[PDB]
Write a structure and sequence with these properties.
Chain A: This is Amino acid adenylation domain-containing protein. The structure holds two protein chains of two kinds. Chain A is built from two helices and no strands. By secondary structure, chain A is mostly helical. Chain A has one domain. Chain A is globular. Chain A starts with a helix and ends in a 7-residue tail after the last helix. Chain B is an all-alpha fold. Chain B is elongated. The chains are: A mainly alpha, B mainly alpha. Chains A and B meet through helix 1 and helix 2 of A and helix 5 and helix 6 of B.
């Protein structure tokens, strides 16, 4: 589990997980 | 008084993710509008404008984008693909894998 994992998956999955991630604020930034 | 190329079907920017970059583009090239299929090179953008643009992407989206991506995706619709991956990079990669494996 490292940043390259997210850049290894295709855009379809990239935006899918990004949405869930932003919505769940697991480590999101409000700066 | 003749500049740019002839339009026939202008394509409006998409919501807040796409319009966000599109708004800045005409200000940089001093253009009219930005269409989702218009190429920065046809519109009036040149390498030096891509350098400053990257610097804006960095502060606008709070990420670290490289100039090569901008030239590789010379239009609004293509550019969003880079924001998607760059945005995820600010989130934690450990917790990300837990959400990722649970996605549809």
């Amino acid at each position: 589990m490292n940043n390259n994992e997210l850049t290894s998956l295709p855009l379809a999955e990239r935006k899918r997980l990004l949405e869930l991630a932003k919505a769940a604020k697991l480590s999101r930034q409000h700066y | 008084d003749h500049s740019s190329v002839i339009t026939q079907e202008y394509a409006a920017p998409q919501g807040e993710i796409e319009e966000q970059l599109a708004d800045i583009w005409q200000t940089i090239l001093k253009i009219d509008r930005i269409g989702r299929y218009d190429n920065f090179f046809e519109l009036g953008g040149h390498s030096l404008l891509v350098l400053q643009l990257q610097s804006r992407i960095n502060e606008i989206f709070d990420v670290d984008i490289s100039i090569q991506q901008l030239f590789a995706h010379p239009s609004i619709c293509q550019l969003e693909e880079c924001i998607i991956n760059a945005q995820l990079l600010q989130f934690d990669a450990d917790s990300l894998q837990d959400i990722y494996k649970s996605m549809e």
